[PDB]
Design a protein around this motif. Structure first.
Motif, PDB file in Angstrom:
ATOM      1  N   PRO A   1       0.832  -1.264  -0.170  1.00  0.00           N
ATOM      2  CA  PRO A   1       0.101   0.018  -0.068  1.00  0.00           C
ATOM      3  C   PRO A   1       0.867   1.264   0.183  1.00  0.00           C
ATOM      4  N   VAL A   2       0.517   2.220  -0.698  1.00  0.00           N
ATOM      5  CA  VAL A   2       0.971   3.716  -0.631  1.00  0.00           C
ATOM      6  C   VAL A   2      -0.026   4.559   0.214  1.00  0.00           C
ATOM      7  N   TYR A   3       0.652   5.190   1.253  1.00  0.00           N
ATOM      8  CA  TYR A   3      -0.127   5.943   1.971  1.00  0.00           C
ATOM      9  C   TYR A   3       0.130   7.585   1.617  1.00  0.00           C
ATOM     10  N   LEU A   4      -1.006   8.177   1.378  1.00  0.00           N
ATOM     11  CA  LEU A   4      -0.791   9.733   1.261  1.00  0.00           C
ATOM     12  C   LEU A   4      -1.757  10.230   2.475  1.00  0.00           C
ATOM     13  N   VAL A   5      -1.166  10.918   3.432  1.00  0.00           N
ATOM     14  CA  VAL A   5      -1.869  11.533   4.388  1.00  0.00           C
ATOM     15  C   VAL A   5      -2.133  13.174   4.465  1.00  0.00           C
ATOM     16  N   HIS A   6      -3.299  13.691   4.167  1.00  0.00           N
ATOM     17  CA  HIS A   6      -3.323  15.246   3.955  1.00  0.00           C
ATOM     18  C   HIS A   6      -4.074  15.487   5.454  1.00  0.00           C
ATOM     19  N   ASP A   7      -3.729  17.151   5.449  1.00  0.00           N
ATOM     20  CA  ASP A   7      -4.164  17.946   6.456  1.00  0.00           C
ATOM     21  C   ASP A   7      -3.547  17.731   7.809  1.00  0.00           C
ATOM     22  N   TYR A   8      -3.489  19.152   8.451  1.00  0.00           N
ATOM     23  CA  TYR A   8      -2.966  19.146   9.732  1.00  0.00           C
ATOM     24  C   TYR A   8      -3.510  18.533  10.741  1.00  0.00           C
ATOM     25  N   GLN A   9      -4.707  18.081  10.891  1.00  0.00           N
ATOM     26  CA  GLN A   9      -5.636  17.621  11.579  1.00  0.00           C
ATOM     27  C   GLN A   9      -5.136  16.057  11.687  1.00  0.00           C
ATOM     28  N   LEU A  10      -4.407  15.614  10.588  1.00  0.00           N
ATOM     29  CA  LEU A  10      -4.001  14.364  10.450  1.00  0.00           C
ATOM     30  C   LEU A  10      -2.162  14.309  10.866  1.00  0.00           C
ATOM     31  N   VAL A  11      -1.498  15.094  11.534  1.00  0.00           N
ATOM     32  CA  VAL A  11      -0.243  14.824  11.833  1.00  0.00           C
ATOM     33  C   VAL A  11       0.295  13.571  12.491  1.00  0.00           C
ATOM     34  N   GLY A  12      -0.521  13.451  13.487  1.00  0.00           N
ATOM     35  CA  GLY A  12      -0.319  12.063  14.355  1.00  0.00           C
ATOM     36  C   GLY A  12      -0.404  10.491  13.722  1.00  0.00           C
ATOM     37  N   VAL A  13      -0.887  10.633  12.291  1.00  0.00           N
ATOM     38  CA  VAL A  13      -1.161   9.351  11.788  1.00  0.00           C
ATOM     39  C   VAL A  13      -0.112   8.636  11.331  1.00  0.00           C
ATOM     40  N   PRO A  14       1.091   9.349  10.971  1.00  0.00           N
ATOM     41  CA  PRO A  14       2.202   8.529  10.225  1.00  0.00           C
ATOM     42  C   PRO A  14       2.818   7.799  11.290  1.00  0.00           C
TER      43      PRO A  14
END
Lengths: 479, 479
Positions: free
Chosen positions: A150-163
């Motif tokens: 899988p290739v993960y693309l994470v967008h938006d400041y609200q998601l800074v914890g996700v990586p």
């Protein structure tokens, strides 16, 4: 063929019913990030994970807990999975991200001498942000559980914890994080409580790639890491961080506009504007109701220009798009602009300056077209798309006044009149010089400004994210 | 034997008359910078140039336009030359340096969203600062005209313009500049109007050596140079700048205390304090009436500790030294602390917290001695001398709470309880932990804290300036 898993705070879906059948329909808004990623060459399939934020989203998530395949033109499709967060937790996180807290941190809203004073509200908000981040991370991994690569693309400041949460379970995966707002200087970032200021960095760094709209924001992020994480080593040249065995690459990926959102159209002005503006040069300021948009200072700078003479048949329109007016900073910003406009009219003559409020994109484009001078003078801005959009649609050769603190100035600043957004005298001088310029000078400057703006499309920005991540992922694998 | 020429904003001279003869006497205050420089080994002679700022200074300058030789102990002497500035120009510069303008810039007072908005007042103030700088530079050069190898020591932020003017006429001379306040991050420094933000850098860089109390302030200065002067090259490792053929060295030269100002004495508490404090542990906060001293947040943090229990027989004294109360920020700071103290007493019980105002050094030292807990929680501070002075005179083993943003934390932070001055919860937790600690733990921590504080004397700091400048001057000559 990459299997893409996009995460963002919202996937904008239109809920309605069919005009003939009366049947409920739900369809993805065109120009969404997920829409564009799905059209790229090396993409086999894509899923979009985002929060449910309306009574219609909640219903669609509960009926299709593992998400709905939605069609797109040219026979393509996207699997859309919406998360139902705990309502109090979600509402608390939404509060945490406004100027009540984190918006002020990344967008330079605190004076330090009187604000802020973090209490127990700050700790509970950080706890709710951890719960919200786990929700996303659970959903994303669950969605990609059957995917080998899988290739993960994470967008938006609200998601800074996700990586960090993704990397925990997916050590070799490509993970991009894109942040659409500024990153503040290290001394400013550290105003935040110790658990938040280090805690957000720990969430972000496990990504393969971290992207910002501007180099300044990359530099500031790196300075924050160095200052707060004694363990980490940064390289200001290579734009990299090494921390606890994670190597991270920082990239600048500017964005200008979506060719769709302007496209080809000629739209009408808001009611009364064309008639009010006739026979006058028109200065236009436009932006959301957010204190960073800086309209108060633009109106005061306009009045200072006018006192210098030459503005006798010049008017000013302040277009404001209502947003989050419940946040005290935002209502206070409208109040302050209103006061300036009132004072401006009482000095220079009735109806010299007018506020016009709505969220109609068509009205905004028409105001960009009518403009004789455009002012985008934000105190700070992650990028500011309007500064690419307006000159691209304006056919009046309007000059543009651009604040040096917008992320756009890194790309357009040489083609605009660049100002310090805190200096009223410099801004007044800029407005007068721009209104005094000849038709040929303005024409030649507008052509160069458009040529500089044209390449920075939504599709190009997506391509840059995928290309950049593929290269960073190869580098992270080989090291 | 170096010929030294010291410049500072003030040479503190006491004017009076002799108790027997009635004759007017004028004598240098002991512990002045000029006094200490005159005692160092490699010093043949010294002159001190500074502004006249009282009706007594004006008179002494007009009577001795080329300055007065004043005696010092051990047969030494110092030639003191005072400048009469144009009264309106001087008054305008004094305004420019307060929180009305430049004090807010170096001490992090602006929120950006609402303040500041530079008008024509800012331009006229910068013009007056140029005239004031020429005055100093003229006087200094005139004083050193007969000297073959003068050594220039320039002190205080008000004199940041002087080095370029000195270097203009004295290309090979050693010139040190010392700045006693913080230097803000590059994004913050650039809030200032373009002529000011670049103009101050151009004034400073021609110095051989530029000194600050802390490494952070050196780093921030270097970042400002890089950001604003495309021509300049910085080296973050060697702490150097190369600009237009000038090489400059940045140095950190911490300062703690003057052994004179504490010395050996046992002084009384201000009226009513000993009796009010008896039978209670006493938390003391002390500082000038300047919003950076952060007493409002210290009192709110005290109330939050108290709500956690254990503070039933604990009281808090907020000692405030009145200074520049005519500056609206300063009067507003006293008003805000008053409001907090009032609210604290109404919640926890009458007379739990008291404000005591004066500028008596003896009272301050006695309050440092009485203290059971000391709080030096400034939002920012160039260094903060009180954090060395108090633990050195306290014999109660009081713990110290020190803000991480004081320049002193680079030297004492490991020996104090280091806090984020914007976080009330962390500060409350620190106060409770400090009051809960055992007598042995506190005793051992206070001994280590004193050993760390003791070396940083006024005389040592002077020696560091001369040693550092001699080494930098040799390096600048050889390159």
């Amino acid at each position: 063929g990459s299997e893409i898993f996009l995460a963002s705070k919202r996937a904008a879906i239109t809920y309605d019913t069919d005009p003939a059948t009366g049947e409920p329909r739900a369809w993805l808004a065109p120009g969404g990030t997920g829409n564009v990623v799905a059209e790229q060459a090396g993409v086999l399939n894509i899923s979009w994970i985002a929060s449910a934020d309306s009574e219609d989203d909640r219903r669609a998530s509960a009926l299709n807990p593992d998400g709905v395949t939605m069609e797109l033109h040219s026979g393509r499709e996207i699997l859309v999975r919406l998360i139902r967060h705990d309502p109090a937790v979600f509402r608390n996180v939404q509060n945490f991200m406004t100027a009540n807290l984190m918006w002020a941190a990344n967008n330079y809203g605190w004076d330090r001498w009187t604000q802020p004073s973090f209490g127990s509200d700050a700790r509970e908000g950080w706890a709710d942000f951890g719960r919200f981040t786990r929700d996303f991370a659970d959903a994303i991994l669950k969605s990609s559980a059957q995917s080998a690569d899988p290739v993960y693309l994470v967008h938006d400041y609200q998601l800074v914890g996700v990586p960090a949460l993704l990397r925990e379970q997916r050590p070799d995966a490509p993970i991009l994080l894109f942040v659409h707002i500024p990153w503040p200087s290290a001394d400013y970032w550290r105003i935040l409580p110790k658990e938040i200021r280090t805690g957000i960095l720990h969430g972000m760094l496990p990504a393969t790639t971290i992207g910002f709209f501007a180099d300044r924001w990359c530099r500031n992020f790196l300075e924050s890491v160095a200052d707060l994480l004694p363990d980490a080593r940064i390289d200001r040249e290579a734009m990299t961080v090494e921390w606890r065995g994670h190597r991270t690459r920082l990239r600048t990926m500017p964005l200008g506009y979506s060719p769709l959102t302007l496209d080809g159209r000629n739209p009408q002005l808001p009611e009364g504007i064309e008639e009010w503006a006739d026979g006058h040069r028109l200065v236009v300021h436009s932006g959301r109701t957010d204190p960073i948009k800086n309209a108060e200072r633009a109106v005061r700078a306009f009045v200072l220009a006018a006192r210098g003479g030459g503005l006798e048949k010049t008017r000013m329109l302040v277009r404001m798009n209502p947003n989050r007016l419940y946040v005290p900073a935002n209502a206070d910003y409208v109040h302050r602009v209103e006061t300036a406009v009132a004072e401006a009219n009482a000095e220079l003559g009735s109806d010299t300056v007018r506020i016009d409020n709505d969220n109609d994109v068509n009205h905004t484009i028409a105001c960009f077209r009518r403009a004789d001078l455009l002012i985008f003078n934000s105190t700070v801005d992650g990028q500011n798309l309007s500064t690419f959009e307006a000159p691209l649609v304006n056919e009046r050769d309007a000059d543009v006044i651009l604040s040096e603190t917008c992320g756009a100035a890194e790309v357009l600043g040489e083609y605009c009149r660049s100002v310090n957004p805190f200096d009223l005298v410099e801004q007044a001088e800029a407005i007068s010089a721009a209104l005094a310029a000849g038709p040929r000078q303005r024409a030649e400057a507008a052509a160069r400004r458009r040529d500089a703006a044209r390449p920075w499309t939504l599709e190009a920005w997506v391509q840059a994210q995928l290309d950049g991540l593929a290269a960073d992922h190869a580098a992270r694998t080989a090291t």
